[PDB]
Amino acid sequence: EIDTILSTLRMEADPSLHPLFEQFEKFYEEKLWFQLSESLTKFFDDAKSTPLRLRLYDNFVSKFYDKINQLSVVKYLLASLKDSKDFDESLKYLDDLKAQFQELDSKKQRNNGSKDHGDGILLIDSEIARTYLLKNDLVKARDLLDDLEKTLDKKDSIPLRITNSFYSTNSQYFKFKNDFNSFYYTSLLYLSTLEPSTSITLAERQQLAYDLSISALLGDKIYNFGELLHHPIMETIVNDSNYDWLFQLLNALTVGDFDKFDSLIKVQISKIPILAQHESFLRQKICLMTLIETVFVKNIRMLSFEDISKATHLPKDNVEHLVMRAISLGLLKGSIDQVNELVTISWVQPRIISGDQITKMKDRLVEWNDQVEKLGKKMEARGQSIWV
Amino acid sequence: FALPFEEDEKNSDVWFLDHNYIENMNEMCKKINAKEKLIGWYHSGPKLRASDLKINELFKKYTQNNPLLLIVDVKQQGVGLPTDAYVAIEQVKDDGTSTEKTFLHLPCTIEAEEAEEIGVEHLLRDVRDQAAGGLSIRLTNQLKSLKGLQSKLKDVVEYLDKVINKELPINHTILGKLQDVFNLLPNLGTPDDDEIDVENHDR
Amino acid sequence: KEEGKIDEAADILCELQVETYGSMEMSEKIQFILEQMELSILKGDYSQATVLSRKILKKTFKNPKYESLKLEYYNLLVKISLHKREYLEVAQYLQEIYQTDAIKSDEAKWKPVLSHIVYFLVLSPYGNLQNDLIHKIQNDNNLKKLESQESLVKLFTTNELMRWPIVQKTYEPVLNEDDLAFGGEANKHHWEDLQKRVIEHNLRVISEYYSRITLLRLNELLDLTESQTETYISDLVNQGIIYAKVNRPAKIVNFEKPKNSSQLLNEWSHNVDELLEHIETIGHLITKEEIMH
């Protein structure tokens, strides 16, 4: 029956995918369908965008729905339809498969009485939202995204896999409007909760690596730069030509060397126009970073407009325009004195903490520790008698 | 109320909880006062354990809230109340690692029935030196507060020391409040700290 | 109307309905009084028109048989306060039109209405009224389909520094294609009015961030001379939107209402209570990490 169809796909397949094909025949017969789940994963990794995949899954989907794991079956379909370039094909396939599942669970959930099929509904649904973002329907996708989110929250536990699919619909939506900041934050959520399992390629990771860095440079408040270098995405992608100078910019921003950033960006701005249309922002971005960072590393909280002028390489006019932007952005709050030529900073925004910063703060605690101990020595000595 | 409970100390990964008892027991709670439902569990201390993460699962099929973890320290240690209180949360970790299940701190305070409150005072006969009364009492509390500050602050310096020499993992969430200690920090010689002197001269 | 006797027609018809009412239907009554208001725009007595508008209650519009009448009526009240140059009133009226069911649901009809609310709200005197209303505009998803409009409001809703020949250059080839507040010989005086409001918008931004700025530097910022800068600050303190004291030697203009001793000190207590709280919470999360490591 199915024994014949596996055999015709096999003949048509490359001899690359032949030894993997065999395992499907053996396991089906022996009825050892856990080793069946392993074989399908193995097969799919190196044959993702082959046309034997989609055909093959069609056979299997019709036969089992609850004789192998619900989580396992649906994730195969999602990776398939990403790679399917006919988007119409995707929208149709999804709706029919979801319906089946909805009908299936009235009877199956109770008979097995330990297996749930309503986790499958969600896994599918995330992809229905993605498929509209391919046909460039923002309205339709947004409606599904508010609903996906409320469902997520209702459960008292989430699998990794569901919340992954949820951050994926999200990511593609935000980057169409071309909103940088909104994108960056989302992507962090997706990266952490991700599976160990490779069903995500190097290509995807590297594409996300390129988008996240664009977002951080062309951003206006992302000082989580250090987080990319201390997180695998950007740390291990350094090795292509693109990701040498890109990596460096981020290293430049932190230490605040204005020369290094400037020099590298002149060469690269021609080649890539995404940086080129946000240039006003890009050039000011490093200036914003040094302005907040000087305040942090000083104990006190006030700077002369003379100091600021040196540090950013700006005139006194443009020093004042720079503090005013920064406040407007909400990096700094305080007061501006033009008649004492001070900025008296009153709050600085939190930020991440690296090794260096750890010690800086540590040292300041040392003085205040002493002040408590000796002030307390004076109080011991007066009214030593009265302590009743 | 107690539940029958066994904890194995050789291997900490084996424990006894009787699920049958809890339902029965809850029914009899309704006899007493039927405004009571299961909202968590007490632990006997002296501290948090990471085997408490596994116990916690079982009590999610009882409750209508995220279950309560209350350390009742039975040896009564701490410079304030001798209870810490935590609640189980599931969350993504932003230091690039997967979704953990973790116990995040909830502050402890007390409120009591009016009736209970006259009994507490009734058994007791201390004059108190950790609550405020007269002048002399408040001097004793003044000194206690300052030495309290000394104790906690010392612990911060040595905590910082551990990350970069013993290698506790950086946790951005904790150190982030310590930055705000600096920005809300008082300053000397500002027109605020001179109002501070002028008010002393008034009083 | 076709005659040169149109003004004479304003006289006959306005007097008549003060003597005549009868038992006619509400729709007919409304229609005469709106016609009369239209003849009083032409007569040049907008104030006379106002008195006739207060005869019919606004509560009478709430039903849908009079749904069309509600639209024309508001639009006449736009023309009337426009003529006297009160842009707060004109801003509020077009908002009445927007909430009406015909405008809101039909895709086409809301467009010119939403564009006009926005142009007029900015021309309004900075009130407490203008505040509540401008940030209502942002809440709507209607607004995001329009792009020239979205960006016009987006400056004023946030606080930023800007200048007048920037506004002038940018928005002139764009919004001189659309009427109301632009073009013409009397609507260039409604355009003219946005120069003061741009200046007023800077004064608010500068008020919050600087508390002492030089008066000599303030002139440069606004693109004005010292006299004009003075007049703008005066009129803005008067309405109760800022507060300042100007020093004529030119040393300082100081934006702030000076704080009592008690005010500064009450804030210093609030910091101390919060510092004691921070040390606590850290202390509890340190105990946690000792088990984890």
Swiss-Prot record, chain A:
Superkingdom, taxonomy of origin: Eukaryota
Cross-referenced InterPro entries: PCI_dom, PSD13_N, PSMD13, Rpn9_C, WH_DNA-bd_sf
Name of a matching Pfam family: PCI
Claim: Protein biosynthesis is one of the keywords in the record: no
GO MF terms held by the record: structural molecule activity
Biological process, per Gene Ontology: proteasome assembly; proteasome-mediated ubiquitin-dependent protein catabolic process; ubiquitin-dependent protein catabolic process
Family per record: Belongs to the proteasome subunit S11 family.
Cellular component GO terms, alphabetical: cytosol; nucleus; proteasome complex; proteasome regulatory particle, lid subcomplex; proteasome storage granule
Keywords: Proteasome
More details: Present with 12400 molecules/cell in log phase SD medium.
Job of this protein: Acts as a regulatory subunit of the 26S proteasome which is involved in the ATP-dependent degradation of ubiquitinated proteins.
Taxonomic lineage of the native organism: Eukaryota, Fungi, Dikarya, Ascomycota, Saccharomycotina
Signal peptide range in chain numbering: none
Protein name (record): 26S proteasome regulatory subunit RPN9
SMART domains (UniProt xref): PINT
Gene behind the chain: RPN9
All copies of domain PCI, residue ranges: 182-350
Organism: Saccharomyces cerevisiae (strain ATCC 204508 / S288c) (Baker's yeast)
Swiss-Prot record, chain B:
UniProt keyword Nucleotide-binding present: no
A single MF term (Gene Ontology): metallopeptidase activity
Domain of life: Eukaryota
This protein's UniProt keywords: Acetylation, Phosphoprotein, Proteasome
Annotated GO CC locations: proteasome complex; proteasome regulatory particle, lid subcomplex; proteasome storage granule
All copies of domain MPN, residue ranges: 1-92
Keyword Zinc: no
UniProt modification remark: N-acetylated by NAT1.
GO biological process: proteasome-mediated ubiquitin-dependent protein catabolic process; ubiquitin-dependent protein catabolic process
Function: Acts as a regulatory subunit of the 26S proteasome which is involved in the ATP-dependent degradation of ubiquitinated proteins.
Family assignment from sequence similarity: Belongs to the peptidase M67A family.
Additional detail: Present with 19800 molecules/cell in log phase SD medium.
Record's protein name: 26S proteasome regulatory subunit RPN8
Organism: Saccharomyces cerevisiae (strain ATCC 204508 / S288c)
Name of the coding gene: RPN8
Complete-protein stretch covered: 52 to 254 of 338
Swiss-Prot record, chain C:
GO CC term (a single one): proteasome regulatory particle, lid subcomplex
GO biological process terms, semicolon-separated: proteasome-mediated ubiquitin-dependent protein catabolic process; protein deneddylation
Residue ranges of domain PCI in the record: 86-260
Highest taxon, organism lineage: Eukaryota
Post-translation changes: N-acetylated by NAT1.
Keywords attached to this entry: Acetylation, Proteasome
Note: Present with 5710 molecules/cell in log phase SD medium.
Assigned protein family: Belongs to the proteasome subunit p55 family.
Functional note: Acts as a regulatory subunit of the 26S proteasome which is involved in the ATP-dependent degradation of ubiquitinated proteins.
Protein name per UniProt: 26S proteasome regulatory subunit RPN5
Organism: Saccharomyces cerevisiae (strain ATCC 204508 / S288c)
Interval of the full protein contained in this chain: 148 to 440 of 445
